[PDB]
């Protein structure tokens, strides 16, 4: 039926998405400060 593997893959997928979003947001912020600094 529902396996540990299935649950673990859902959790892994969610953790990956959280990380991608965190680092994209963080990259977007740093590119913006540098955009301003470049004028």
């Amino acid at each position: 039926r529902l396996s540990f593997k299935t649950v673990a893959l859902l959790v892994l997928a969610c953790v990956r998405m959280k990380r991608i979003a965190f680092y994209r947001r963080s990259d977007d912020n740093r590119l913006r400060i540098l955009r301003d600094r470049i004028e």
Binding site: S3, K5, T6, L9, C14, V15, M17
Partner: protein, 144 residues
């Protein structure tokens, strides 16, 4: 790249996000699962994920896009197992931590004669005020 069984297994995982069985993952489905797991994504983070993952442009993650999201994890499975095995070489007692005494034993094995003080200093450079190195720190250390 992927076997019939690998596809099947990812489909089951995908199906758990897809609460209304529509064949795709909506922004509300994504946000709900992530929040229930304590990951607390902001709205901007969810909006960004939908944009990045659903390149189809429908604000609904399809199965093929879910697979592309998770494919790197498959490519990286051997490396993950190696990382854990390498960590185990240091971690002789198997408590999930590397101490200076365990580091010293590896050093001696490979013919590196360091004083105990130097071993302490070697470990301290990569430990975070801690007396020991955990798997997270071991991995972080190798991220340059």
């Amino acid at each position: 790249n992927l076997t019939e069984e690998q596809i099947a297994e990812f489909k089951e995982a995908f199906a758990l996000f897809d609460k209304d069985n529509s064949g795709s993952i909506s922004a509300s489905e994504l946000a709900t699962v992530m929040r229930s797991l304590g990951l607390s994504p902001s709205e901007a983070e969810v909006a960004d994920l939908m944009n990045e993952i659903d390149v189809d442009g429908n604000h609904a993650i399809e199965f093929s896009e879910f697979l592309a999201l998770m494919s790197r994890q498959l490519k990286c499975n051997d490396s993950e197992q190696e990382l854990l095995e390498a960590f185990k070489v240091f971690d002789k007692n198997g408590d999930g931590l590397i101490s200076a005494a365990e580091l010293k034993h590896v050093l001696t094995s490979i013919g590196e004669k360091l004083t105990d003080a130097e071993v302490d200093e070697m470990l301290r450079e990569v430990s975070d005020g801690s007396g020991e190195i955990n798997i997270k720190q071991f991995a972080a250390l190798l991220s340059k």
